Short mmCIF file of N, CA and C and ligand atoms in Angstrom, two decimals:
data_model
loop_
_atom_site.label_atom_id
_atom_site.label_comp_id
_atom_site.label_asym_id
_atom_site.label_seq_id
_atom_site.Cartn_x
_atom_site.Cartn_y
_atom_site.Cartn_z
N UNK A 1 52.62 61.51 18.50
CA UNK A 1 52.16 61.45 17.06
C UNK A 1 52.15 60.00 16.45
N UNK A 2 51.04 59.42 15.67
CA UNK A 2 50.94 57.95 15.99
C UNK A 2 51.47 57.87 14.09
N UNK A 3 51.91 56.79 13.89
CA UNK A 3 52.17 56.76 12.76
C UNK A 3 51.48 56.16 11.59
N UNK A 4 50.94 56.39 10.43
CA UNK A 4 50.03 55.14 10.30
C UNK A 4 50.24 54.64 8.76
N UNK A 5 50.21 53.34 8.45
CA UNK A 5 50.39 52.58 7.40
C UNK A 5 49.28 52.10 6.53
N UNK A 6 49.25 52.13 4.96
CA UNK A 6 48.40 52.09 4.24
C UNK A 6 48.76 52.40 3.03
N UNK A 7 47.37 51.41 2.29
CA UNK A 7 47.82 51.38 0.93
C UNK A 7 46.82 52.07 -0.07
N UNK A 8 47.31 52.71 -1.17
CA UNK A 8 46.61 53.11 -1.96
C UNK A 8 46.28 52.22 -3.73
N UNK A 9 44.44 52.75 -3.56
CA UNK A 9 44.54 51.47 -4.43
C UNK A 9 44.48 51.41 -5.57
N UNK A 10 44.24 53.14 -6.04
CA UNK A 10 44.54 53.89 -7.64
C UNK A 10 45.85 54.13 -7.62
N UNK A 11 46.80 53.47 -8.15
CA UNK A 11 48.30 53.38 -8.43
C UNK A 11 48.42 53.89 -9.75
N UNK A 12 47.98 54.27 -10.86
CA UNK A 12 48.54 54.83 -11.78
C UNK A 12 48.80 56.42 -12.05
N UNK A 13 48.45 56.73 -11.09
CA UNK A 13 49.19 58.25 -10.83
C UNK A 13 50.17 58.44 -10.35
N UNK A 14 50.42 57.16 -9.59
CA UNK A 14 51.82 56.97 -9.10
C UNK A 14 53.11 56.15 -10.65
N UNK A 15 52.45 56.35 -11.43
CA UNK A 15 53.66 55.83 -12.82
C UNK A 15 54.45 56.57 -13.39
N UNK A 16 53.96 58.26 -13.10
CA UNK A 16 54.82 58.72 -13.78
C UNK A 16 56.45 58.91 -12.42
N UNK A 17 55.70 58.87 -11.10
CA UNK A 17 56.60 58.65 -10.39
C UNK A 17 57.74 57.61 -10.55
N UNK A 18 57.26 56.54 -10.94
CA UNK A 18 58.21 54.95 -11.29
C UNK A 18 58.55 55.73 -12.37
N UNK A 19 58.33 56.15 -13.35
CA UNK A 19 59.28 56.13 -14.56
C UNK A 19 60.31 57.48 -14.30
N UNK A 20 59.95 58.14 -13.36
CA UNK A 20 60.92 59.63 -12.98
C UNK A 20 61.97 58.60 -12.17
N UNK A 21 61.76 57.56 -10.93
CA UNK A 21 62.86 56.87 -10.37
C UNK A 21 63.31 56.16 -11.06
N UNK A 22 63.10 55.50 -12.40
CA UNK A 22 64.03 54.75 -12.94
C UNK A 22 64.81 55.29 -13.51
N UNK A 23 64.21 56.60 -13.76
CA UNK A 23 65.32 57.50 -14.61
C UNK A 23 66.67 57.66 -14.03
N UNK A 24 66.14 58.11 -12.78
CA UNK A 24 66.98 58.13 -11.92
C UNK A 24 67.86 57.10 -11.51
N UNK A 25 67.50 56.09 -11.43
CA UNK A 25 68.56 54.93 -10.96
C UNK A 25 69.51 54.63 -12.04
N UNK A 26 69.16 54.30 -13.12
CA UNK A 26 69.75 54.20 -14.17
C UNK A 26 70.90 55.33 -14.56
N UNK A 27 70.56 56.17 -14.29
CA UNK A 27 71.91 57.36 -14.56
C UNK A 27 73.02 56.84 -13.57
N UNK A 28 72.76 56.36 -12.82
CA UNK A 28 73.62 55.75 -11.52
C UNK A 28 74.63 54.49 -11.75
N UNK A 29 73.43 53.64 -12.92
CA UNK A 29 73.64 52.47 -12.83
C UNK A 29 73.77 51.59 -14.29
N UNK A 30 74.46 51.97 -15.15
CA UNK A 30 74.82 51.99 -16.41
C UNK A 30 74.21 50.46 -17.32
N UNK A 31 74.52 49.46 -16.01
CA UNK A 31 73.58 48.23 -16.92
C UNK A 31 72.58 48.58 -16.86
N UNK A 32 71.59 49.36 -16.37
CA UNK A 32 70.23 49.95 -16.01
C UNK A 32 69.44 50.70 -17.88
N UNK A 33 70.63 51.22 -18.57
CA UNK A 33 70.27 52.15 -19.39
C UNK A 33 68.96 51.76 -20.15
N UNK A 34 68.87 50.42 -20.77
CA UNK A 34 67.97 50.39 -21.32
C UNK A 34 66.57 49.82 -21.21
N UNK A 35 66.17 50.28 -19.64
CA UNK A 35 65.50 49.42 -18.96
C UNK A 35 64.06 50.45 -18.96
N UNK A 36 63.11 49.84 -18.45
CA UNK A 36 61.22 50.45 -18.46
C UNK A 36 60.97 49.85 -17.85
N UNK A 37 59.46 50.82 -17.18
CA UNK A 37 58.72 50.30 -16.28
C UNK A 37 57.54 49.77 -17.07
N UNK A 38 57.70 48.17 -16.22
CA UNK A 38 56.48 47.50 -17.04
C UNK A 38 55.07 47.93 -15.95
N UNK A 39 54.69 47.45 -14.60
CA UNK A 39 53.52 47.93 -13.95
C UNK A 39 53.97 48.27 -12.86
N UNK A 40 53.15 49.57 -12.54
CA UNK A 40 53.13 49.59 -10.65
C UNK A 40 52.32 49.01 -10.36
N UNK A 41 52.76 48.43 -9.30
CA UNK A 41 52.44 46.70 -8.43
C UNK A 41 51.71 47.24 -7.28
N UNK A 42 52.11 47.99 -6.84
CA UNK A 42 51.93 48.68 -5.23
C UNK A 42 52.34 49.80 -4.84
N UNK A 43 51.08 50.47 -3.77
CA UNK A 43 51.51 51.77 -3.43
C UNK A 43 51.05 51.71 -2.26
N UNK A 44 52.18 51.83 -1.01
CA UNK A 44 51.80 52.02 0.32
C UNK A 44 52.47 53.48 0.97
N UNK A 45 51.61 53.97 1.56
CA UNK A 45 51.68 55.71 2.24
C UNK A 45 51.94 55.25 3.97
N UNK A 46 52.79 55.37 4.49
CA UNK A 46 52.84 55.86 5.49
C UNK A 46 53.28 57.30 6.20
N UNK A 47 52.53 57.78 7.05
CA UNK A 47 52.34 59.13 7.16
C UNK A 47 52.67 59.36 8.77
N UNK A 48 53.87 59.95 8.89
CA UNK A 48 53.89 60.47 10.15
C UNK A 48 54.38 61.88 10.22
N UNK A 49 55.06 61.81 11.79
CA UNK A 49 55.12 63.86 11.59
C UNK A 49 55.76 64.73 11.22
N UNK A 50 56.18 64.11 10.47
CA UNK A 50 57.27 64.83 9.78
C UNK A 50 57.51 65.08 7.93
N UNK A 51 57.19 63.76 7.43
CA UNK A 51 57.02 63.28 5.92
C UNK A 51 55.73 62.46 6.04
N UNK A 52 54.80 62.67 4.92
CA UNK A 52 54.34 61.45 3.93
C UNK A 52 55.46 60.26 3.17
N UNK A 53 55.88 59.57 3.21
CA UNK A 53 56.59 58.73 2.46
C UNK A 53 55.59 57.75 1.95
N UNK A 54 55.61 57.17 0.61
CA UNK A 54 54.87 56.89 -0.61
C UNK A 54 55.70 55.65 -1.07
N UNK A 55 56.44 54.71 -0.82
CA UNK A 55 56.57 53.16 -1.56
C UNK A 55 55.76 52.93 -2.37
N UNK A 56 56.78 53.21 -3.78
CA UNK A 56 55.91 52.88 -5.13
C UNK A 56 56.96 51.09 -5.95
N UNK A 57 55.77 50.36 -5.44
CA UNK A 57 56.38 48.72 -6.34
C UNK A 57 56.38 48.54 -7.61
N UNK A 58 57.04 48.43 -8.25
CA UNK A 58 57.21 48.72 -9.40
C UNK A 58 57.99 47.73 -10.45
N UNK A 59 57.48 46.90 -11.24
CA UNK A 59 58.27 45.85 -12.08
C UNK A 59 58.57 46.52 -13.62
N UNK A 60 60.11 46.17 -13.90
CA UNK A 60 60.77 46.95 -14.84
C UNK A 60 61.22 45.78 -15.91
N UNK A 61 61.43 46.08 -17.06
CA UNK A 61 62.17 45.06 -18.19
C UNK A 61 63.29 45.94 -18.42
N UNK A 62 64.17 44.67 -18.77
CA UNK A 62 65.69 45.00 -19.58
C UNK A 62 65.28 45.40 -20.96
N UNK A 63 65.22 46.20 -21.65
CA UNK A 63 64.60 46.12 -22.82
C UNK A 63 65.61 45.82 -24.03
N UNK A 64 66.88 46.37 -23.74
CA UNK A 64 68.20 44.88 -24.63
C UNK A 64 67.86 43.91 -24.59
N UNK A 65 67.46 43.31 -23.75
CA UNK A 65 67.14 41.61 -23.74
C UNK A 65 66.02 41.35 -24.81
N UNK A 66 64.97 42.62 -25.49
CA UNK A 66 63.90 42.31 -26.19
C UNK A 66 64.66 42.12 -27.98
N UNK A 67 65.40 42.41 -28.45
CA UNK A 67 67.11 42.49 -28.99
C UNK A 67 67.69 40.83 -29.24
N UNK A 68 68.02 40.26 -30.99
CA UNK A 68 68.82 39.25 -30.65
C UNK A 68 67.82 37.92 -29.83
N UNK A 69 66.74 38.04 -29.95
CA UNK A 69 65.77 36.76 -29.52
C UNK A 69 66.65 36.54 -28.16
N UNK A 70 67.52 37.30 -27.36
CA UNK A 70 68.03 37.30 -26.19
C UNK A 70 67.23 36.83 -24.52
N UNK A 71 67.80 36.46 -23.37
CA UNK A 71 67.19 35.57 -22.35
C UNK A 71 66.41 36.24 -22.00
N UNK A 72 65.00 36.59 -21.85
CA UNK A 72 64.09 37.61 -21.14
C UNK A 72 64.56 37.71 -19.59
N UNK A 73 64.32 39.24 -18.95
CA UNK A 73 64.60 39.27 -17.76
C UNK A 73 63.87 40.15 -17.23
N UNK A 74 63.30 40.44 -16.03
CA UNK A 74 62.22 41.42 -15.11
C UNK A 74 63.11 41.89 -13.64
N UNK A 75 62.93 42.82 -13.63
CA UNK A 75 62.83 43.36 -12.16
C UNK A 75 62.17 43.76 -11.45
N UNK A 76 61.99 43.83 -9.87
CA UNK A 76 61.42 45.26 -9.27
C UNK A 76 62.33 45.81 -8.72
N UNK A 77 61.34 47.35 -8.61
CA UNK A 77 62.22 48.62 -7.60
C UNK A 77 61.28 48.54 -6.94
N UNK A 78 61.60 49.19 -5.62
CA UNK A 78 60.88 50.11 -5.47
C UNK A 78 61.47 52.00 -4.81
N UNK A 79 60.91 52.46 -5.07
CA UNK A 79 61.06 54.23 -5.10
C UNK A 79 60.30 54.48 -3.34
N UNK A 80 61.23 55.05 -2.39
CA UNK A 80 60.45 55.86 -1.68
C UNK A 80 60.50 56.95 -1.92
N UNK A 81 58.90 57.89 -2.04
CA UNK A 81 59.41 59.15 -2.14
C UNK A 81 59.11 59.89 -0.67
N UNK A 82 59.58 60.57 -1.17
CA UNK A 82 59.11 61.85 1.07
C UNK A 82 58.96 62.62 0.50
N UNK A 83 57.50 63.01 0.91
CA UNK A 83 56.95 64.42 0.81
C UNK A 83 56.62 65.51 2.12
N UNK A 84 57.25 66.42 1.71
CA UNK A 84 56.48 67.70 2.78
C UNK A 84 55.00 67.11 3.07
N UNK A 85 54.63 67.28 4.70
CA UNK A 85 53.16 67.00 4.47
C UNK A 85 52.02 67.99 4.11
N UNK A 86 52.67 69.37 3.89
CA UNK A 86 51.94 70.16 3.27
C UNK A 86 51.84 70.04 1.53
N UNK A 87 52.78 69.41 1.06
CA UNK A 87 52.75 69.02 -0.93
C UNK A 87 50.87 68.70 -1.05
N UNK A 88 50.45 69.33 -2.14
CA UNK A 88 49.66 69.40 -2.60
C UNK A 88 49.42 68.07 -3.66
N UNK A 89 50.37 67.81 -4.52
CA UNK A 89 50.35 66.74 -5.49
C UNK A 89 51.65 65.95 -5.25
N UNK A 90 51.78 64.88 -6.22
CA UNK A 90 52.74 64.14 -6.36
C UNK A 90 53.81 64.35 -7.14
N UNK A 91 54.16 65.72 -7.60
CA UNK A 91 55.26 66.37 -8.86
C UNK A 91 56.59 66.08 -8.21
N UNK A 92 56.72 66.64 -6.66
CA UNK A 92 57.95 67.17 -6.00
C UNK A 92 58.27 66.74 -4.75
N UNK A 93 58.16 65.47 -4.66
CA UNK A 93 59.16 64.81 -3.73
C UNK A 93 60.33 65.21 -3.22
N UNK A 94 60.34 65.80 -2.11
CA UNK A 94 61.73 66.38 -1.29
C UNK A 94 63.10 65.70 -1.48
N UNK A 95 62.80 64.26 -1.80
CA UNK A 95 63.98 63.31 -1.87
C UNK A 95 63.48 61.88 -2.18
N UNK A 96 64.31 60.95 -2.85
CA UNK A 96 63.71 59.67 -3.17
C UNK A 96 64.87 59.09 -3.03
N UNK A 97 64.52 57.41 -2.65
CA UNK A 97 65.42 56.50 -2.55
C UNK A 97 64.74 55.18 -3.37
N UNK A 98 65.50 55.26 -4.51
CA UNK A 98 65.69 53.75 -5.16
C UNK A 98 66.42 52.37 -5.14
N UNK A 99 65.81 51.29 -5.32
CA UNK A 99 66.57 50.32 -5.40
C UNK A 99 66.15 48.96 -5.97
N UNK A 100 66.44 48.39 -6.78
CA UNK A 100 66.16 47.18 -8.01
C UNK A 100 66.92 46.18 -7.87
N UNK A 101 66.49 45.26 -7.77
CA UNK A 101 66.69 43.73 -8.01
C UNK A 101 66.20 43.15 -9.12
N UNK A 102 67.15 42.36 -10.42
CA UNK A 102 66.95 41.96 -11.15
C UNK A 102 66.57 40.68 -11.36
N UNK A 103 65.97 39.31 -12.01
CA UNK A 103 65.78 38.35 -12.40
C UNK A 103 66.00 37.72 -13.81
N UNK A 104 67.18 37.41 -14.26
CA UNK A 104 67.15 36.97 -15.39
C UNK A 104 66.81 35.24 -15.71
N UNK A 105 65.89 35.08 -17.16
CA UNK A 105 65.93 33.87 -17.12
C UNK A 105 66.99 32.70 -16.81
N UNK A 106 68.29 32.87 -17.62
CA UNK A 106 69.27 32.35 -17.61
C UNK A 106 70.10 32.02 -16.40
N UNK A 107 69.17 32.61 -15.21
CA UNK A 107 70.52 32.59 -14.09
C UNK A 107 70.00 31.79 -12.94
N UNK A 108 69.13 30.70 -12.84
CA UNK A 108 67.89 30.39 -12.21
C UNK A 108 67.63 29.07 -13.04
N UNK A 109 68.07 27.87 -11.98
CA UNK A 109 67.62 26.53 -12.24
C UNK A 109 67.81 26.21 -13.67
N UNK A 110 67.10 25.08 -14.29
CA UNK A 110 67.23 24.45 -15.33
C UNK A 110 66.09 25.15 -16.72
N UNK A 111 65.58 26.43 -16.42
CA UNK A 111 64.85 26.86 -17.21
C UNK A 111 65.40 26.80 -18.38
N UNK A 112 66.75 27.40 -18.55
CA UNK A 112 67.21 27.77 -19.81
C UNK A 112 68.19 26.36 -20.62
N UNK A 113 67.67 25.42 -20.40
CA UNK A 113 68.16 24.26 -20.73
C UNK A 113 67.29 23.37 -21.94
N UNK A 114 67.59 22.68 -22.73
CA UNK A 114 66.90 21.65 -23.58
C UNK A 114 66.29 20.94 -23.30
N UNK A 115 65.93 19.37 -24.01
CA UNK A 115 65.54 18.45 -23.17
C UNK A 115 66.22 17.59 -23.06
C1 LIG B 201 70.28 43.94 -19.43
O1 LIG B 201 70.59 43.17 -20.58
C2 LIG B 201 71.87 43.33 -21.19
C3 LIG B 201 72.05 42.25 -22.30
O2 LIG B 201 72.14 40.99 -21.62
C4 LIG B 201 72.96 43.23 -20.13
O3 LIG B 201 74.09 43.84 -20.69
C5 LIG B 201 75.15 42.90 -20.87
O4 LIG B 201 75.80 42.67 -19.65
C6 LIG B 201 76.80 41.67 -19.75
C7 LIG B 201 77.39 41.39 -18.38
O5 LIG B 201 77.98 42.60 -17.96
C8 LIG B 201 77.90 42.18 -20.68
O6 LIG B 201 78.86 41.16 -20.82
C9 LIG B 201 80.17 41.64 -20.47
O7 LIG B 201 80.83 42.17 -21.60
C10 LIG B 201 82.04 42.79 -21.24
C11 LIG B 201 82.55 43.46 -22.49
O8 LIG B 201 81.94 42.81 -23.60
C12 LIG B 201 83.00 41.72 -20.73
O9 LIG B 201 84.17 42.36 -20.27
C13 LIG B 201 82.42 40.95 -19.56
O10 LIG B 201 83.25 39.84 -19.22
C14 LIG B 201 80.99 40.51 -19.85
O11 LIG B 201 80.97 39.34 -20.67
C15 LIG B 201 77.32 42.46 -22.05
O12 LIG B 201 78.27 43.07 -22.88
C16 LIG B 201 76.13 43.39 -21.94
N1 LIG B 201 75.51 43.31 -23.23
C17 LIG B 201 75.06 44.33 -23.92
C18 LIG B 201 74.44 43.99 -25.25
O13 LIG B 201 75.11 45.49 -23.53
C19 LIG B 201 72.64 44.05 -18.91
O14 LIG B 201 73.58 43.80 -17.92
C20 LIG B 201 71.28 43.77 -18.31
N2 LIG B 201 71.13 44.72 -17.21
C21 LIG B 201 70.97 44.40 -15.93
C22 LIG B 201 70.87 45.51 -14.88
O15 LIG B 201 70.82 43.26 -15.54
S1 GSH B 202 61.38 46.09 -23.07
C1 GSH B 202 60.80 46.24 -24.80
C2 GSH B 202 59.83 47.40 -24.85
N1 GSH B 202 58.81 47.21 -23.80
C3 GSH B 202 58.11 48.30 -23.38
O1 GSH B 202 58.34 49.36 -23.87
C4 GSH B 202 57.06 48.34 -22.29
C5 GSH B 202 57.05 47.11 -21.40
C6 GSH B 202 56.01 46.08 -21.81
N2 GSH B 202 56.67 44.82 -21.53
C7 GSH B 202 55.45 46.00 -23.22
O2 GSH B 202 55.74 46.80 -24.12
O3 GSH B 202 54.67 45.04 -23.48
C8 GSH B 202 59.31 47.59 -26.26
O4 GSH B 202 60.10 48.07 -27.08
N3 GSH B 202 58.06 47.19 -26.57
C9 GSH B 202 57.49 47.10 -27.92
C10 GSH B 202 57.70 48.33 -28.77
O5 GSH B 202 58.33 48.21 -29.86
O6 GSH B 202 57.26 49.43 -28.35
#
């Protein structure tokens, strides 16, 4: 059974997916609480015999940081989901795995400095 890799290139059906995994991570992850998905970036399907799995890229804001003229900061996740390869739509992912890396201005070279 050969496995095969690929990307899809209408990604916004895949958003409500990003905003169901952030939900999710965030219950997990308490500095997370007040965070949104700003765009899905990317969507790659690889399909073998067992699952569809769906990598959804996904860049998120701290939205406290929008609060207090505070340091702006961005992340990405990304969400795998696995689907039965019989699933019809994208509602019910058998299981998902999240994970986010943050970027804050403040923490990174001389940006946040005077002159
Ligand atoms: C998203 O943005 C907010 C605002 O910057 C971040 O929350 C802040 O996180 C810092 C670091 O944990 C908190 O500071 C800590 O405060 C505790 C108690 O005050 C103190 O014990 C620690 O030494 C530290 O200074 C800060 O309170 C918290 N601020 C707010 C307004 O909630 C948050 O971490 C960012 N999220 C992520 C995932 O990066
Ligand atoms: S993080 C601050 C909020 N941002 C968003 O809700 C979506 C992400 C985008 N960066 C954007 O809105 O441009 C927010 O509260 N936005 C403005 C508002 O008051 O709705």
């Amino acid at each position: 059974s050969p496995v095969l890799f690929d990307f899809i290139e209408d990604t916004e059906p895949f958003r409500k997916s990003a905003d169901k995994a952030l939900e999710v991570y965030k219950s997990e992850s308490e500095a997370y609480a007040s965070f949104r998905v700003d765009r899905v970036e990317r969507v790659t399907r690889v399909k073998g015999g067992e699952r569809t799995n769906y990598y959804v890229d996904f860049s998120v804001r701290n939205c406290s940081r929008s609060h207090f003229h505070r340091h702006p900061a961005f992340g990405f996740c990304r969400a795998d989901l696995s689907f039965d390869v019989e699933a019809s739509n994208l509602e019910n992912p058998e299981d998902v795995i999240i994970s986010c890396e943050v970027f804050n201005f403040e923490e990174h070279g001389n940006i946040s400095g005077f002159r």
